[PDB]
Amino acid sequence: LVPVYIYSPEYVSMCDSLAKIPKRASMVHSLIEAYALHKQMRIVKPKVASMEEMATFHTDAYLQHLQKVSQEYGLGYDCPATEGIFDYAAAIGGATITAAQCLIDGMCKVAINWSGGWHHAKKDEASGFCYLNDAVLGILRLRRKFERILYVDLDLHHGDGVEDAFSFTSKVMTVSLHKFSPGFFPGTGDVSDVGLGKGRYYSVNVPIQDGIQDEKYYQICESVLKEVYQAFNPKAVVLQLGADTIAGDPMCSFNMTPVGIGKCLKYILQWQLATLILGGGGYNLANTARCWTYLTGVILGKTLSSEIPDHEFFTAYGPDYVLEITPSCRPDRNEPHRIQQILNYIKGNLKHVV
Amino acid sequence: XGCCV
Ligand SMILES: [K+]
Ligand SMILES: [K+]
Ligand SMILES: [Zn+2]
């Protein structure tokens, strides 16, 4: 009954190599290990995904091209192809599949891959810094065993890659809370977004405005997850916990702290379903480690010391060197009416789910 | 993030 923790020196080094989040993976692992949390988990070395495994989602054309350039397809602007990007992609994909396979094998009820959760990538297109959609690959693998999977995406951005991947099916319900605002990436996921054809009503979207804080975010999340659990009754959960919601992120939109996300996490954990935990966004690296370390503590039912332990990256935690994050002084633009209207739509949509 | 964001 012990959480699986996907890790290996090689996997972390590979993930540390992303130019936009250099060494984020080491900071996150280091802090966790500094709090000694790895000792209470089952460390599992990730396997690298095969072409056939990655092909469960991505097109052969896309994958063959990625490997080519690693030595079009959205591979520019936000998603430039660098050397070794294909080995990177395969590492993350295989790590999330390893997480899934553990859950299938009854090895654990919770399997953590903090450097996965790249939720924007499409079957044949990179997008939003995501080159391979390991979240989708995790779900497809779980799908070999579970008849109904719930995907919950708490990243700041709409989980469009995963939603699109399953928009026509009722076997995986996707739930995304996210900033929805003009010109804001990726532009999709209004509350009227409910999925298509046979997947109609099995996509759930909660559009949210700048400045939202812990209490309001949890009220929203809990009321939605309540309804979703009731109507859909999942057999397994995949949870993306992007940390770009946390106060002080370069994405500068929400005003969350890890305690708030933490409460959402606890709510999901009490369902006692096989749960696959993923990271994702998080562009303030020290804050992202703070968040994901605290959340590992939540997973472990542990209360962590507020003093940041001495470790490799201790100096990145100044000027206060504590675990807690203070909300900023920014306005909360979520009007209580709009929110209630949103919940009501969702409530109505879900009644169609049986 | 579509752009360098
Ligand atoms: K989201
Ligand atoms: K769906
Ligand atoms: Zn994001």
In 3D space, the residue among A139, A140, A184, A186 whose CA is nearest the CA of residue A160 turns out to be A186
**Phi/psi at A256 (nearest 5 deg)?**
-80, 160
Residue of A nearest to B1 (CA): A128
Contact A240, A154 (CB under 8 A): yes
Q: Which residues, at least 6 apart from A214, have a Cβ–Cβ distance to it below 8 Å?
A: A256, A257, A259, A260, A263, A327
In 3D space, the residue among A92, A342, A352, A2 whose CA is nearest the CA of residue A192 turns out to be A342
Two tokens at A345?
Answer: 């739509």
Would you say the C-alpha torsion A11, A16, A19, A21 has a positive or negative sign?
positive
Contact A216, A260 (CB under 8 A): no
Q: Is B5–A127 a contact, with Cβ atoms under 8 angstroms apart? A: no
A354 C-alpha to ligand 3 centroid (Å): 31
One-letter identity of residue A346: I
Contact A278, A117 (CB under 8 A): yes
Q: Is A186–B2 a contact, with Cβ atoms under 8 angstroms apart? A: yes
Contact A280, A240 (CB under 8 A): yes
Q: Is B3–A185 a contact, with Cβ atoms under 8 angstroms apart? A: yes
A237 C-alpha to ligand 2 centroid (Å): 13
Residues from chain A contacting residue B3 (CB–CB below 8 Å) = 77-78, 185
**Ligand with the closest atom to the CA of A151:** 2
Q: Is B4–A128 a contact, with Cβ atoms under 8 angstroms apart? A: no
> Which H or E run includes A14?
helix A9-16
Q: Is B4–A186 a contact, with Cβ atoms under 8 angstroms apart? A: no
Q: After which residues is chain A broken (C to N over 2.5 A)?
A: 71
Domain with residue A215: its CATH number is 3.40.800.20
Would you say the C-alpha torsion A291, A240, A245, A259 has a positive or negative sign?
negative
Q: Which residue's entry shows tokens 């030595």?
A: A71
Residues from chain A contacting residue B4 (CB–CB below 8 Å) = 77-78
DSSP-assigned letters across all residues of A16-43: HT-TTSTTHHHHHHHHHHHTTGGGGSEE
Q: Work out how many domains chain A is built from and give that number.
A: 1
Q: Does A248 touch chain B (CB under 8 A)?
A: no
Query: A232: domain range?
Result: 1-354
Resolution limit, Å: 2.1
Two tokens at A117?
Answer: 């959760």
Q: Which residue's entry shows tokens 């690959």?
A: A137
Q: Does A77 touch chain B (CB under 8 A)?
A: yes
Catalytic residues of A: 120
In 3D space, the residue among A142, A130, A139 whose CA is nearest the CA of residue A106 turns out to be A142
Contact A41, A2 (CB under 8 A): yes
A345 is in an annotated binding site: no
Q: How far apart are CA A97 and CA A91, in angstroms?
A: 10
Residues from chain B contacting residue A127 (CB–CB below 8 Å) = 2
Q: Which residues, at least 6 apart from A2, have a Cβ–Cβ distance to it below 8 Å?
A: A40, A41, A42, A108
- Inter-axis angle of helices A85-104 and A134-142, nearest 10: 30
The CB density around residue A87, as the number of other CB atoms within 10 Å, is: 13
| DSSP annotation of A38 | G
In 3D space, the residue among A139, A92, A140, A90 whose CA is nearest the CA of residue A113 turns out to be A92
Two tokens at A284?
Answer: 């303030």
Task: Describe the strand order of the beta sheet including A42-44 as a list of residue ranges.
Answer: A42-44, A4-6, A110-113, A274-278, A236-240, A149-153, A172-179, A203-208
Determine the residue among A20, A75, A77 to mutate to test chain B binding: the one whose Cβ has the most chain B Cβ atoms within 10 Å.
A77
A193 is in an annotated binding site: no
